[PDB]
């Protein structure tokens, strides 16, 4: 959708690890990643369902 969905996965830094989801434009679907708590970007969602609503083509 918006160009935020095309941003790269960014695991960031810091050690407050939380599992997040990001949209992968190459597979047209969201996948999980571990975010460290600092230095990420906006292609980062708390659930697969939210990532898919905001980002996926259908």
* Cα dist from 50 to 1, 13, 14, 41, 53, whole Å: 13, 23, 24, 16, 5
How big is the chain, counted in residues? 58
Q: Phi first, then psi: what are they for 53, rounded to 5°?
A: -65, -45
Q: Which residue has the tokens 């047209």?
A: 28
List the resolution, Å.
1.2
- HEC profile for 6-45? HCCCCCCECCCCEEEEEEECCCCEEEEEEECCECCCCCCE
Q: Which residue has the tokens 């935020």?
A: 4
Experimental technique, in short, is X-ray
Strand partners, 18: 35
Domains of the chain: 1-58 (4.10.410.10)
Q: How far apart are CA 22 and CA 46, in angstroms?
A: 9
């Amino acid at each position: 959708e918006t160009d935020i969905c095309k941003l790269p996965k960014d695991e960031g830094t810091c050690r407050d690890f939380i599992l997040k989801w990001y949209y992968d434009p190459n597979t047209k679907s969201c996948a999980r990643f571990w975010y460290g708590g600092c230095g990420g970007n906006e292609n980062k969602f708390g659930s697969q369902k939210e990532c898919e609503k905001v980002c996926a083509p259908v």
